[PDB]
Each structure stands twice: as C-alpha cells, then as structure tokens.
Amino acid sequence: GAMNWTVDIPIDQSLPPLPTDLRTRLDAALAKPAAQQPTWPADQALAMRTVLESVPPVTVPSEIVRLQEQLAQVAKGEAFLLQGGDCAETFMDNTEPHIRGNVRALLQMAVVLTYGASMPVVKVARIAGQYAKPRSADIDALGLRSYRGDMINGFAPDAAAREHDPSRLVRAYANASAAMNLVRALTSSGLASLHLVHDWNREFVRTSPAGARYEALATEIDRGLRFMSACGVADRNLQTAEIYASHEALVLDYERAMLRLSDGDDGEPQLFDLSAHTVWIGERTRQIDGAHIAFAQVIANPVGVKLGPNMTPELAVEYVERLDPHNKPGRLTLVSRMGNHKVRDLLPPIVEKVQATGHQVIWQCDPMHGNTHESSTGFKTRHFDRIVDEVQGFFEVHRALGTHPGGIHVEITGENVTECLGGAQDISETDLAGRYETACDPRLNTQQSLELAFLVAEMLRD
Amino acid sequence: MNWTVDIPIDQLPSLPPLPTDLRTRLDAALAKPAAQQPTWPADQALAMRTVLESVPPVTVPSEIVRLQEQLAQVAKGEAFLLQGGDCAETFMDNTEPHIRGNVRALLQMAVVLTYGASMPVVKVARIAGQYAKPRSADIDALGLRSYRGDMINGFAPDAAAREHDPSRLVRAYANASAAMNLVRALTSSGLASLHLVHDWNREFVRTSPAGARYEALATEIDRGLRFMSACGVADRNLQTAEIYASHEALVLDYERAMLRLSDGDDGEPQLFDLSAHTVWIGERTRQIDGAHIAFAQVIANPVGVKLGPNMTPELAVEYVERLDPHNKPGRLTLVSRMGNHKVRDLLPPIVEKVQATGHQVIWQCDPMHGNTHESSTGFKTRHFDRIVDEVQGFFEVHRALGTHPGGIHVEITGENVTECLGGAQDISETDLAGRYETACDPRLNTQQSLELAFLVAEMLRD
Amino acid sequence: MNWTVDIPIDQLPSLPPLPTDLRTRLDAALAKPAAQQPTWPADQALAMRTVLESVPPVTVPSEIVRLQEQLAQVAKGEAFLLQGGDCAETFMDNTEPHIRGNVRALLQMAVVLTYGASMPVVKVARIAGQYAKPRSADIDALGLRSYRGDMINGFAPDAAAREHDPSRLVRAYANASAAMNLVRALTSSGLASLHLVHDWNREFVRTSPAGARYEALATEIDRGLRFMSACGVADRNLQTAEIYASHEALVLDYERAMLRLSDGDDGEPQLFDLSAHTVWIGERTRQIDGAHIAFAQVIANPVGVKLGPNMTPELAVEYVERLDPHNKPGRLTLVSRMGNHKVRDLLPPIVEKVQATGHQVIWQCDPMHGNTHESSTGFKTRHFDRIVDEVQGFFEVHRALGTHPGGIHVEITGENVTECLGGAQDISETDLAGRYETACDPRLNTQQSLELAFLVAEMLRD
Amino acid sequence: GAMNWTVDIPIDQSLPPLPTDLRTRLDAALAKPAAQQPTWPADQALAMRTVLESVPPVTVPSEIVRLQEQLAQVAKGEAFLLQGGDCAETFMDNTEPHIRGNVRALLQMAVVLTYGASMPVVKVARIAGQYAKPRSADIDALGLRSYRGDMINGFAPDAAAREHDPSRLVRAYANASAAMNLVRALTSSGLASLHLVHDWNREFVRTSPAGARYEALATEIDRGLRFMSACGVADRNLQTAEIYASHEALVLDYERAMLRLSDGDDGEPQLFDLSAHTVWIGERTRQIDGAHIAFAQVIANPVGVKLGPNMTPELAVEYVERLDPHNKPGRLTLVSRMGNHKVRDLLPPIVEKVQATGHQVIWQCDPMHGNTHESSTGFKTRHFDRIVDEVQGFFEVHRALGTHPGGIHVEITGENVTECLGGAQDISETDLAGRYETACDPRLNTQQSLELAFLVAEMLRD
Numbered sequence A, D: 001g002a003m004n005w006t007v008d009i010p011i012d013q014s015l016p017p018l019p020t021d022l023r024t025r026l027d028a029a030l031a032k033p034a035a036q037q038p039t040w041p042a043d044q045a046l047a048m049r050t051v052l053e054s055v056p057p058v059t060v061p062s063e064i065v066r067l068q069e070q071l072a073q074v075a076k077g078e079a080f081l082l083q084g085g086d087c088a089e090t091f092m093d094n095t096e097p098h099i100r101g102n103v104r105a106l107l108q109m110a111v112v113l114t115y116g117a118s119m120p121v122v123k124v125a126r127i128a129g130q131y132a133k134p135r136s137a138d139i140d141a142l143g144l145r146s147y148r149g150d151m152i153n154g155f156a157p158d159a160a161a162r163e164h165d166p167s168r169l170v171r172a173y174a175n176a177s178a179a180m181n182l183v184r185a186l187t188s189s190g191l192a193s194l195h196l197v198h199d200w201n202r203e204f205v206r207t208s209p210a211g212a213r214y215e216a217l218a219t220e221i222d223r224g225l226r227f228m229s230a231c232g233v234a235d236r237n238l239q240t241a242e243i244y245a246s247h248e249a250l251v252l253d254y255e256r257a258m259l260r261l262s263d264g265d266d267g268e269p270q271l272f273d274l275s276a277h278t279v280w281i282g283e284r285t286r287q288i289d290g291a292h293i294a295f296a297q298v299i300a301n302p303v304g305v306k307l308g309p310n311m312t313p314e315l316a317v318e319y320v321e322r323l324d325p326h327n328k329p330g331r332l333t334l335v336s337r338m339g340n341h342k343v344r345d346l347l348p349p350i351v352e353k354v355q356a357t358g359h360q361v362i363w364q365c366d367p368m369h370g371n372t373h374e375s376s377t378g379f380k381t382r383h384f385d386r387i388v389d390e391v392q393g394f395f396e397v398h399r400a401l402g403t404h405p406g407g408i409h410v411e412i413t414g415e416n417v418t419e420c421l422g423g424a425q426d427i428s429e430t431d432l433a434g435r436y437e438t439a440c441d442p443r444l445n446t447q448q449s450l451e452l453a454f455l456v457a458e459m460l461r462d
Numbered sequence B, C: 001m002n003w004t005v006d007i008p009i010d011q012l013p014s015l016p017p018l019p020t021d022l023r024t025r026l027d028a029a030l031a032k033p034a035a036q037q038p039t040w041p042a043d044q045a046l047a048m049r050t051v052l053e054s055v056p057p058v059t060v061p062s063e064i065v066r067l068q069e070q071l072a073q074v075a076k077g078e079a080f081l082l083q084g085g086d087c088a089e090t091f092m093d094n095t096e097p098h099i100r101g102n103v104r105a106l107l108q109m110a111v112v113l114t115y116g117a118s119m120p121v122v123k124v125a126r127i128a129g130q131y132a133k134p135r136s137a138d139i140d141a142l143g144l145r146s147y148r149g150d151m152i153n154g155f156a157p158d159a160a161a162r163e164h165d166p167s168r169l170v171r172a173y174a175n176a177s178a179a180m181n182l183v184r185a186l187t188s189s190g191l192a193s194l195h196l197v198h199d200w201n202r203e204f205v206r207t208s209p210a211g212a213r214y215e216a217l218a219t220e221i222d223r224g225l226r227f228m229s230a231c232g233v234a235d236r237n238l239q240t241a242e243i244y245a246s247h248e249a250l251v252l253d254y255e256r257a258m259l260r261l262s263d264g265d266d267g268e269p270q271l272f273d274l275s276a277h278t279v280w281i282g283e284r285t286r287q288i289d290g291a292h293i294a295f296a297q298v299i300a301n302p303v304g305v306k307l308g309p310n311m312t313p314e315l316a317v318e319y320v321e322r323l324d325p326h327n328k329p330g331r332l333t334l335v336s337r338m339g340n341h342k343v344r345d346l347l348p349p350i351v352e353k354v355q356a357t358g359h360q361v362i363w364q365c366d367p368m369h370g371n372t373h374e375s376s377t378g379f380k381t382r383h384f385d386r387i388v389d390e391v392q393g394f395f396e397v398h399r400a401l402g403t404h405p406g407g408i409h410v411e412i413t414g415e416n417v418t419e420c421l422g423g424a425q426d427i428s429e430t431d432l433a434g435r436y437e438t439a440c441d442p443r444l445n446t447q448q449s450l451e452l453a454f455l456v457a458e459m460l461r462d
C-alpha cells in the first residue's frame, strides 16, 4: 500500500492451452542455455510471469504483420529502416517530455532520410521496453553488482539497489504500456505532421553552428514538401506516421510472459511476442544453440541479430537459415557493428555469402556499438566522426557489391546531452561532464542525431 | 505467503509545477466541498498525487480539441453521440479479451446507428478510468464498508479489502493507460474495419432469436456498404475509427493529479484533464457550488452532467451558465436519466428552458440509470423494454420541440452476461443467476446492446 | 437562295500512312463482301476517307484499354454494363440540351442500377456516331429510297435529300467530335455528380404516377448515399463518372478511315477504331464471312454482336472463336434480342454452348429490338411491359444457369417523347401522336427509362 | 457535297430569349465601334452565326467558374499562371500529332514551373480557337490583302484565298471543338501523368546542348517527385491535369454566336462565352469605349487585356474599373508586353497605380510580342535572350514592389521549328530557313520553351 510505496497485486483468480506443437517448441527453446539472465528466485519469477500473462499487450499481431510487410520492402531495396532511441530507457525518465523528445528526434531524422533515400522510411523506436542490458562483468568498477537495466535492478550505486528484483518485470510492463500509449497518441494526433516536423528541422538549420553546411539540403526538402501541396496531394498521409516499438529481447522471463497466440483468422495460429513489434538478439546472447536464437525461431515477429567483428560468413548464413527458414523477405535483419576502421574489410565477405543463399535480409548498420572508447575525463564516449565513418564504410561496402544498404540503428535522444564527442557543437572531453545522463551507453544528442541524418542522406543521394 | 505481490513505486523526477496563476485558480475551486470522496489520509493522497503528476498522460490535448470539434457537430444536429461500456471497470477484468469485446460491442452499435442516423457517430467508450463510484450508504448488506470501485477499494467482501487505499490511484492509472494503449492499437490496426464489424452484425442477425425482425435493416446496411465499393470510394476511412475514453470524474485526487497544461502552439495553453477525453459529473456530486462542478469549470475537456427526475429547469440553466460560459457548442452535454414512465413529462420543460438561453448543449439520453429495479431472485436488474421505452420517449420529446436528440449513454459489455431482463433472448429472473458479473449496475449484454442499436436506428429513421 | 450553306473542306496535310503489314491485313479483311453499304462513288468515298484519316480522333487508345479492363470485370461477374441512348442520332438534334438530357437519363439509370447491382456500372452511351442504319427494303412507303441515317442521307422525304452523299462522312465526324467534347465536359465538370443525379431521381419519385411504388427503393438509395458522407469517405469519385461512346459499326468507309495505330508505350502498337470506344455489329451485317465481322477481328476495341431469334448455339460459338481468339474476357459481348415471349426458350442453349468454350463473354440483354410492333394509329412502337418482361426472362435464364446477366442495351432519351406504349404514364396509342420524334425506332422516354432502371434494380436484388 | 469539296448545312429548322437586361447590354456593347473586324456580308455572317448558336459549346459554364476560382488564387499570390501555344492555329495543322505536341510542351513547362514556384500552376493553352489575328496594314508586303487567320481567310499567297469568307466561322468552330475533344481526352487518359511528363523533361536534359546547365534543377525535381511516393501520397491527382482553352477574342461575329446563358442554379443567369474558358483583348482592339472591351464587360469569363509600351497608369486603372467592377480577384488579368529594354521602366508606375485601387488583378508577362525584329535573311524573328530578359525584368519589377509576378504568356510549339533565334541550340539567322512554319509570329520551339521554363523557375526560386 501507500505506506510502503507499493501497489499490491493479486496473482490467483485462466489461460488457454497452446497448440501442442507450439508448447513443445517453446519448451524446447527455453530449455536451452541462456546467457545474461537475472538471478532471481524461480518461484518469484513465476508469480510475476503469471501477472504479465494476463495484462493487455503492448502491441497486437496485425501491427506486427503490417510491420513485416513494410520490412519486406526494405529487404527488397524499396524502403529504408531507421531505428533509434535510448540505449537504456529508465523508469525515472519515462515521462511525457522525454518520450515526446525522443519521438520528435526520430521523426526529424526520418524526414531527412525519407527525402535522401527517395523511398519510404520504416521508423522503429528503441522504446517501450528497452529496460534490460547484458554485461561482460558481473562486478562493475565500483565493486557493485553490475546494473543490468531497470527491468532487473537499480542504477543507483548501492548494493541493495543492485539486487535482482523480479517485481521489476511488472514494472517494465507498466512503464512500457504507458509509453506506448503516448507514442500512439502523439503520432496520430499531430506530433508526426510532416510539416511540423520539418519546421523543427528548419529551426535546427537556422541555429546550428554548421547550419550553413546543411542549408542547401534543408531548402531542397522544403521545396519538395511544397511541391506536394502545389500538386494538390498534400493529404491525410502527411499528418501522421507509424512509429514501431523495439527492444533487445534479453530477459526471457519477460518475453515469454508477453507471448500471445494469434486468432488464426489469417493463417494458422502462431506465437507473437507482444511486448514489442520487433526485437533483436545482441552479441552476448546470440549463441547459435542458445535459448535466445531458439526463442526467436518460435515467434512470428520480425527479428534482428547483431553481428560484431568476430562474425564469419558461415555463421551468418547459419543465422539466416535458422531464423528465415521460409525465405520471407524482411523476417530477418542483420545488424552491422564492426567499428569504422573494420567495416570496409569485415562486412563484404559476410554480405556476399548471405546474398548467395537467395534469402533477402535487411542489412542494417549499427555504427555506435563498435566505436566506443573511454575519455581521459573518465566517461564512456564515442566520436561522432567515427560513427559517421562507419555508416560511410557500410554504404561503400554495399555500393561495391550492388546490395541494398537497408538502414541504420542508432542510440539517440531528443535531449541536449553531452555524451558523444564532436558534431557541429564540437562536444569536448571537458564538455562531457555537463549533461552526461545516459544510464548506459553514450547517445547522440538531438542535434548530433539530426546532423547524422543529414550526412547519411548525402550518402543515400551519392 | 498470501497470494499478492507488492510492486514498488517511488522514483519521482522533478517536473516543473503547473503555472502559479492556474494553480491559484485551481486551489480556489477545490476549496469547495466535495461529496463522496475517499477517506484516506491526506499525506498519503499527496504522495500518490505527486506520482501521478509526472506520469505520461492517458490522452493528449489535441485529441480533446478534436473531440470538441466533433461534439460541436453533434450539438448542431449534424452528428450523433454514442457512449457506452461497463458500469464499473475492474482491475482483474482489464484484460485483452474483455477490452476487445467491449470495443467490438460499441463498434457494432455504431455501424447500425451511423446508418440509421445518416450522419457521423462520435464513439466514446466508458473505459480506461471508470474505476470509482458513489454510494448511498456507508454500510452494505454484509455489514461492510461499501465497495467504491477499484480506484478506492476492493470488491471482495472482506474488511481489509474495503479500506480506502490510495495506492489504488496509481494502480488505476497503470490499468487505464494499458487499456487505452490497447484501444488505440485495436482501432488503428483492424478491429474497427467497417466491413469486419458489419460481418459480426450479419452473424447476429443470422443467429438471434429475433433476427428476422432485424434482417431488413441489416440487409439495407449491407447494401449501403456495397454501394460504397460500387462507387469506388477511397476506402481508407472505412478501415479505422476513433474511440474516445470517458469516465465519471469522481475522485478529485485522481483527476487533479492528471491535470496538464497544453503547449503554446494550439491557441495558447489551457488546463486539460488528461486521464480521459471527456468526463461527466454524476447525480450525487453535481452540487452547483461543490468542487466537482467547479473542477469541470476549470478544465478545457468537454463535460457532461447527469440530470435525474429531481432536476428543475432553473438548475439546468445554472449548469449551462457555469459550465458553458463562453457559449461553445458541444462543450456541455446534459444527460437525461428520468425513467421511461417519467421522461415524456419531466424532460420538455428542462429542454425549453435550456434552449432559450441561446447555448447549444448536447441532449443525451441515459436510459438505464433511472430504470433499475430489484428482481424476486435478489438481483439488481433492468428491463430491456423499459430501457428502449425511455429512448423512445426521449426521441418524442425532441421531435415535439424541434430539438436534436443528440445521443445515448448506455452500460454494455461484449460479454454474454445475464444482467438485464428481456431482449430477444428473453432473459428471465431465473436466468440472471447464470452470468451476473457486473461489479455495479446491470449491463446490456452484447446481443442486447446490438438489438438496442437496431431499435434506436428505427427511431432515428422515423 | 435556298436555306443551306456550303462549308468548304479540303486542306489535307500529309500524315504518314498506317504500317504496310497492318494495311496488308486490313485490305485482305475488307475484300470480304459488306452488306448494307452506301452506294456512293468510290472516288468520292476515297477522297472523304482521306480527309478523315488525318483528323483528331474522337477517342484515344488508353481510354479503350481502360474500358477493356472494366469490361473484363463485367465478364467475370463483378460489374454490370449499361448501354443506352438514341436509336438514331441526327445532325439537327445534336444540340447541347439534347445531349445533356441523354447523358442525364443514362446517369439516372446508372445510380439506381449501381445500387441495385451492388457493383460498378460501366456506362456506355449510344452517342457521338450512331448516324447510320440498315434497311430491309430499298424503297419506303413514300416511294423514296430509304433513309439510312445522317451519315448516308437525309431524313426529309425528298429525292434529293435521299441520295447517298459521302460529304456526310465528314459532317458525321464533326458532329461526333463536337458531341464527345461536350460529353467529356459535362461528365467532368458536374453533371455526373452522384448527389445531383440522385436529386433528379428523387424528383421523379415525387412526381411520377407510380412514385409510390419506387419510393422505398429510392429512400434506401438516399440513405446509402448519406451513409457515405456519414462514414467520411473521400468523396472525389462521387463528383464525376465515365461515359463511353459506342455505335453500330456499319459504314465501313467511316470506320476504316477512323483507324489509328496506338503508340509503342502501351504494350506495343495495335489498330484501334477511334471513332468510338466500343462498337457492335448488327443483325443484318454479322455474316460470319462478311467484312463487318472481319473488321471487328482486326481492331483492338471491345466489340459486341447482336443475336436475334434465328441464332444457333453453333454460330454463336463461331463468333466467339473469330472475335475472341485470345480469350480476353470482356473483349466480346453477345447481345441477346429475342423478344420477351422467346427469350426464356431460345437463350439457354446459346449460353450453355458458349460457356462450354472456356471463353468469358459479356451477356447483355437488348430488350427493345425484338419487341417492336405497329400501332393501329400507324406508329412503330414497343410496349413497356414487353421490354421489362424480356429483361426479366433474361435474368431467369442466367439465374438458372449460374451465369452472369451482364448488362442491358436500351434505346432511351432524356426527352419527354411518346414513342413506347405503357410505363407509369400509361402512354396510349392515341398519345403516340403527341411527341413521336425518333428518326428510327421508338425510344423509352426519360421517365420510362428511369422506371425500367428501378424494375431492373429489383431483378438484380432478387 | 463531295464533288464540290463542301459540306451542306441547313440553317432554318429555336432560341430562348435573353433576359431583357442582358439583351440590352449585349446590343449596346456590339453597337460600339469595333476594330479589326472582317469585311464580309452581313447576311452571310448572320446565317453562319445562326448555325453556331445551336452547336454544342466548346466549354461549359461550370468549368469557367472553376477556372475563375483557380485564377483568384493566382491573383492572391498563391498560384502561378502559365499560358501558351501557337501564335496562330491553322486548320491544316489541327492534327493529333500537332495538338498532342503542343499539349506536351505546355505540360513539360508546367512541371518545371510548379516546382520552381512551389505552388499550383494554372495551365491555359492558346488552342481550340486561336484562329484570328489583327493586322496593322490591310495590304501585306506582297500586295495581297493581309492574312488575318483561318477564321477569316487563307494563308496562301493568292488573292482569291485572301478574300474574307464567312464559312470560316463554322470551320473555326468544327476545328476548335475537335481539338478540345482531344485535349480533354489526352489530359484525362495519361498524357498529363506527372511521372510521364517529367520523364520527357529528363530526356531533354540528357540530350540538350545545355543540359548540364539544367541538370541540377532537373534532379531536384525528380527527387521531389520521388519524395511524394516515399511519403505515400503518389495519388490520383498526379495522373491528370486540367488544360484550359484560350484565345484572343477578336472576331465578334464568332464570339457573339458562341454566347450561352447559364442555368441560374448558382446565382442569377449570366452570359458566358463558350468558345473558350478565358479570352483576352489585344493591343489593337482594346479601345476603352470600343466593342471588345464592352463585350468583355458583359461575359462572365475571366478576361485579360494586353498592355503595351504606350499604356498609362491611369488608363490601366480605367480597364480595371470597367472590367473588374465587383472586385473579384482573378476576373481580370493585365498582360505585360513592353519589350525587354523597357519593362523595368514602364511597368512599375502601372503596377503601383493599379495596386492602390484595392483590386487584385493577375500580372502576367508576355515577353515575346514586344521583342520581335526582322532577320537579315528576311524572317520575322525574336531573340531568346530578349525574351528571357523581359521575364527577368518583370520579376525585378514585382520583387521591388512586393507584388506577385503572376504568370507568363508565351507563343510555343511542341514542334522542332526554327523560328526564334538563340537558345541552347543556338538557332542562327541561316538556321531560320530550315523549319519556319508559323502562320504568324515566331514561336519558341519545344526545347526553347522548356529551357525558358527552367530559367523562369530560377527566377521564381530567387
């Protein structure tokens, strides 16, 4: 109750049985070894899953089917995928201003990228569930059990806060569903009006230190927008946009509890993970025979897999063959995360081998993860130039092969933070201390994220 | 050890407070006495309000502006208001199937009423917040403090559950936002497809015991639908519908904590209650000098006031003057609930007097509240025939005066419950015991709610 | 001195001839004997053809391609063909009011048939070229060479006017192009507004002597229309309609001079007759080895063949094989004209036999040609009841076979003439003398044509 | 008949009386002196007018009302007017290829100008009636009676052909209506598809000698077009365009016979000149008290007046006050034709005085008429550079005053003629002899016309 700053929730007082085959397949998948799982008691986990099994889902199957159709276009070279948001959402910052700000920042980039790509952009936020992270060490630099995101434990640097708390599963859901509600309301009610979003971009050009550099493209966009009105098709489709929800599928207690069975109205019933529209499997959890990859094989959602510098062409093909066994364009995204100094050399053989299979994956560039270093001032950071250069090298790789550079996956925020070095604002090592607010990796701030969109539109325009 | 789990709350950020001048005005309004308020401690109420003041809102201002525009159209005789859902929502029934069924039931009625009215229907659900009710006595038949709805206490007949627990404010918010999220998802992704909804209507006609009576009208609607395809009309606006959220604004700790200031872009900034799109004030809390009416004066949302058989023309005029001071059509809805045997006599003088003010209110009929009685078998119930008859009389009143019968307000569910007597299923006093599931008043079940829509369509066509 | 004026022609440019290979094929086809051809001199015919070969066409190939696609839909049971207009157009009646009235009459029928059929209506006018007819005898009751239509000779009962004058080919072209221009203007600028057309229908119901009989259906259509507005459907496709031009391809000097080659962009280049969108071959010129059928084989336009009571199943199959060699659905329409007393007997074996070919033709009912008789008062007339009854029987035939009753072909005008007996106006033999204006067969007047549409809508609904 | 190469047309065998006031006003207007009229016999003129009074009109009133609404937008600074086509249409070149070519050339310019202006372009062809011209001398340089266009006499240099022949009035109508039919068919059936038209422009850029100069803008346009598809509004409005018909209202026998009275459905009945959508009064016929200006005051069509170098600010205001007496934006266009060496000096005082009246005229630049000279090789010609420079000076005039440069009026053709000197093809005095085909003034060829559009788009983009 209020006295204890808690909400009391019944468990008992129920659930339809899965078709026998899905039950068998789901059980087999979750029996496999699973890295990076929280270490809380099984009985407490079960009680929380029982609560999540009967909540209203964050997403619904027909939206995920629509998303799959739109990603199929990306895979075929007829659309571009933009995925972005916080490295780690926090319960504390899950507020209207912060959510609106991140949605705005993604929409601003999307305008620029839609124009530069000359094709639709599929817009996927890291939001409404990006509450869990993996760690390479279980003890961090202060001697505390590592923070693993708010679905698992607390960011505060004290031991009690770092204990793995299963009640955070139900907390992740409440925060996710509330954020998703707002994302839906904002995108349908005026925040995603193309004209309004573009006006924000014009303001950026007017006030940025390198605005002169981006002015010409910004004017071209503006004239492109006015052309639509001139031609008498400035219609309803300019007033709204679809922003999909994504996160890393990390905590299997959470993902399994958010599974729901489709109606079967279209095709036979399948399992959908309704905690999001699409999810990805990270570098530390992509064991080929592990539980995450197997869980991904059982769900109908579009999925991605992060591929780092030790990836081989052969293992990549094995991911394709296990995760896209029916050859459905768009079902699988392969994220490229090699570091800017390595992408030009490591990616081509992977791409060639995968293309030779006849499957159509989306090739997406994750510039930021492979380019993180430590500042002299003691902050985890990334240089803007390295981020840009990885996306550049990724484009060059695809141009040379004739394949489709399908999208990017970035960590950004609508906040004016000081987390990544460089950009037109020339964020320095000493600037970092001003507003270093991320609960995990360093994000592009709103200006740097928009600037990146401008630079990438130029790579698109070639 | 017992079967609940405590979910920890806290984690407040500091968001800036509402402006001083509007808080000054708000404090003056809430100094007025409030009936029917929970009896929990102020310091606890304050702490929970503080939580709610920083959460993502359930609705956003531009939606409410848009609803106000649609309601202006109703007030002018150019659209029809349909408002419906559970008497009392409960936390344990706030599930995907129950929410989906209720949205479905409302949509089914809306197809038939749209055709029958030959004009747009504004679709407002009682949902995502109808978690509080008044009571007449503080002591129920079992010797317990009364159930006041899940925002205040628990339905279970035990003392501990019946204590007023302000942590339920936060639980109510979580449940509301989760439900609204789902309502948004369903209505934008296919549940609200006109063709799908109408197929469900065709199945009702094929299987209802009185199908034969509704067949002609249903075939005519079907032919209306096919005519649209035959004329090649751009059919996107047939794929989705807007369902707004409403509830009784009862618990002022909740409503006041959900107050937000709109951004400057939309014609300056005003106070909206973002716990819903529209709210109404009930019979027991509409004291002209009380805090509920004062609260309604201060917010920009459209509002309604329930008007029972003790209402006088003069008091009605006073509502108009306090609540529509700027003569904005549709800002105020007066909801008539006089009982079928009294409506034809009591309503006309109220209408004439209000019409003479020069203001344009929406006249909405609530035919279920004034027609409740006790079955021999001991269940609170309502006879279907009396519900229909009150709507009939409501229409007669307006026809005779040349005023617009503007809408209905009903309690319904998509479940096949046995709560109201009659309908084509001829539910008897004996049947009531089968599925009497309501946590408060008896609801029209899914078949009865649809049947009523057919009967009201014929009143609209006459 | 007499009251005509000579308008000089000549002024040929040199446009390149049609390709040699297609001219070679065309010359071979037109070496076949042609019935019912004007008897003017070849050198004069050649000079006028030469004029026509370089004029701007009445229609263009992409319109005819689009009509063919719409006719494919009719052939497949997913649309309905309505074809109607004057029996014989005349040069002196080719005025704005008469053309507007005829377009109006056709549109009025089309609203009612679109609603009744619950599917698109392809609207084809007999207009902009129906300037030629056959005759049985070369000598009429007045001892003169027969009137053959204004493309060949004059209606006036005098010898000089009755001589076959090839300058009328050019006059026919000028009149056709002027009429088509007006049909295009009217249908794109407001005459073909669904709401306006339906208002005219409401006025007919309010004033017809049998209005009461049609009131229910008309109100239902009205409510169908308002439902579209109520559902907020994008209403641009309600503002205009397509009316195609058709006539009997009779005068081969005219049809051959109006042949054009389509440009390369639309799937290679073929021969179209650009004097109209679709043409049909009449009873007297459908010799299987004659030039009319051969001409129809060579052109890409959709074509029709009239089928009277002497038709055999086997001959019908031969039309199918000569005229639909590539099995393109809707390319061929077979138009039944068997008389109401014979249709139920004679049509079924033709249909079964044609259906068994595997080809998809449009089955269209011409209910006026086989039901003509002579009034005591000395006027060629038709009884409305017999016209309706032939359509009735046509529908019965198709229902019994499970085939698609595809359309109707009627002779109508928007004028209030007195040419056919019966209808709600109960036109009598005596009334015929009031306004018997047709230059050939008796037409349904505007009221009768609309009444028929209502009756045929009820056949479609049954 | 054919023998005489003539079509014989009845006159007798009728016309509703005008409202008394329109009759009076029309009579008063035509009783005023009229310059530049043909000198044929009054009785023969009358017979031809009698024929034209009952033909199907070239345009219909609702189209002219729509055009007036679109021109109102131009006048208000929210659209741009492009008007263009042959200096003089000829009966001999009134062919499909020539009409399609001129329509194409206008559409190509319009794409470029729509993009450059960032607003809609109203597209008005000089077509379907531009068959009459004024002359300063009645005897030309060969001693023959001057050619005055094909509605009056024959271009051929012999005396008999130069006689004024009233039958040409009926000939102008037949040619006009046929051309209009084709313009309608082309613009509604695929020729005016934005994507197709723009593809022609890309081909021009690829093959023009100065294509490199226009490449950047052409690519920007292309990306603007693809942006519309990317945003999911590449809709129906991109598939067609409206091309309006215009000519100089010169021959009053023709214009008066093409007058028709509106239905009065919208407003009281007015006279519309249905020989075109809009007409203008030239320099030699704009006598303030003459019949042309007075005729223009009686018709409801939008009208223009050409203003040459002797115009004064005071007389311009008098044209505005007589021709736009009700202050209807768009009703009146003032065409600027001062020569490139004079426009910067003569236009500003005219514009200032007219703006001071509070009326909103469209200011349109006619670059070509004021910049004609004689080549050494003996051809009437114009230098491209002078044409461009007049439009430049016109823009500078309006920029300096803050007024709207509303449009251009040019003489062009889709043919590859050699009539105007210069352009990227660098047409020289000796080149002129290659394809000097105009029946009157020298036209921009297809390439020069498109090039001008590019240069003007840059003036628009400023």
Ligand SMILES: N[C@@H](Cc1c[nH]c2ccccc12)C(=O)O
Binding pocket: A091, A092, A094, A171, A174, A175, A178, B009, B010, B011, B012, B051, B055, B056, B170, B173, B174
């Ligand atoms: N994000 C805050 C506020 C909050 C409390 N309960 C919630 C339920 C749903 C959404 C947000 C909240 C928290 O989790 O403490």
Ligand SMILES: N[C@@H](Cc1c[nH]c2ccccc12)C(=O)O
Binding pocket: A107, A108, A110, A111, A114, A120, A121, A192, A193, A194, A197, A237, A238, A239, A240, A241, A242, D230, D231, D232
């Ligand atoms: N709905 C389109 C266009 C659009 C509207 N708002 C946007 C914001 C950003 C980018 C595109 C848009 C899309 O999503 O592509």
Ligand SMILES: N[C@@H](Cc1c[nH]c2ccccc12)C(=O)O
Binding pocket: A015, A016, A017, A018, A026, A053, A256, A257, A258, A259, A260, A261
């Ligand atoms: N959530 C269950 C699986 C499950 C059982 N029944 C279901 C119905 C629908 C979706 C999932 C399920 C688990 O973790 O094992």
Ligand SMILES: N[C@@H](Cc1c[nH]c2ccccc12)C(=O)O
Binding pocket: A009, A010, A051, A054, A055, A056, A170, A174, B091, B092, B093, B094, B171, B174, B175, B178
């Ligand atoms: N409605 C159930 C389940 C639940 C728990 N927490 C929630 C948060 C949001 C929505 C639903 C829930 C309850 O309130 O006990």
Ligand SMILES: N[C@@H](Cc1c[nH]c2ccccc12)C(=O)O
Binding pocket: B107, B108, B110, B111, B114, B120, B121, B192, B193, B194, B197, B237, B238, B239, B240, B241, B242, C230, C231, C232
């Ligand atoms: N969007 C329209 C049509 C519509 C779509 N789905 C519906 C369901 C019920 C009624 C109408 C509709 C409306 O809300 O009126």
Ligand SMILES: N[C@@H](Cc1c[nH]c2ccccc12)C(=O)O
Binding pocket: C091, C092, C093, C094, C171, C174, C175, C178, D009, D010, D051, D054, D055, D056, D170, D174
């Ligand atoms: N239809 C009339 C009037 C007319 C003369 N020439 C025309 C040319 C086109 C249209 C109509 C006409 C006729 O043919 O005598």
Ligand SMILES: N[C@@H](Cc1c[nH]c2ccccc12)C(=O)O
Binding pocket: B230, B231, B232, C107, C108, C110, C111, C114, C120, C121, C192, C193, C194, C197, C237, C238, C239, C240, C241, C242
């Ligand atoms: N364009 C649609 C609807 C329509 C517009 N005007 C009409 C007149 C009659 C019938 C239908 C229509 C059609 O042709 O079907």
Ligand SMILES: N[C@@H](Cc1c[nH]c2ccccc12)C(=O)O
Binding pocket: C009, C010, C011, C012, C051, C055, C056, C170, C173, C174, D091, D092, D094, D171, D174, D175, D178
């Ligand atoms: N333009 C040519 C061809 C032609 C003859 N008669 C016509 C009638 C209408 C249109 C064109 C023509 C001419 O006037 O000689």
Ligand SMILES: N[C@@H](Cc1c[nH]c2ccccc12)C(=O)O
Binding pocket: A230, A231, A232, D107, D108, D110, D111, D114, D120, D121, D192, D193, D194, D197, D237, D238, D239, D240, D241, D242
């Ligand atoms: N219909 C729009 C767009 C358009 C279609 N085709 C065109 C050709 C040229 C210019 C514009 C267009 C317009 O007329 O503006």
Ligand SMILES: N[C@@H](Cc1c[nH]c2ccccc12)C(=O)O
Binding pocket: D015, D016, D017, D018, D026, D053, D256, D257, D258, D259, D260, D261
């Ligand atoms: N054309 C006639 C005027 C006229 C008489 N009746 C009309 C009816 C409609 C339009 C014009 C008229 C003239 O030249 O004097």
Ligand SMILES: [Cl-]
Binding pocket: A016, A017, A018, A023
């Ligand atoms: Cl199970």
Ligand SMILES: [Cl-]
Binding pocket: D016, D017, D018, D023
């Ligand atoms: Cl008159």
Ligand SMILES: [Mn+2]
Binding pocket: B087, B088, B411, B440, B441
């Ligand atoms: Mn209730």
Ligand SMILES: [Mn+2]
Binding pocket: C087, C088, C411, C440, C441
């Ligand atoms: Mn006939």
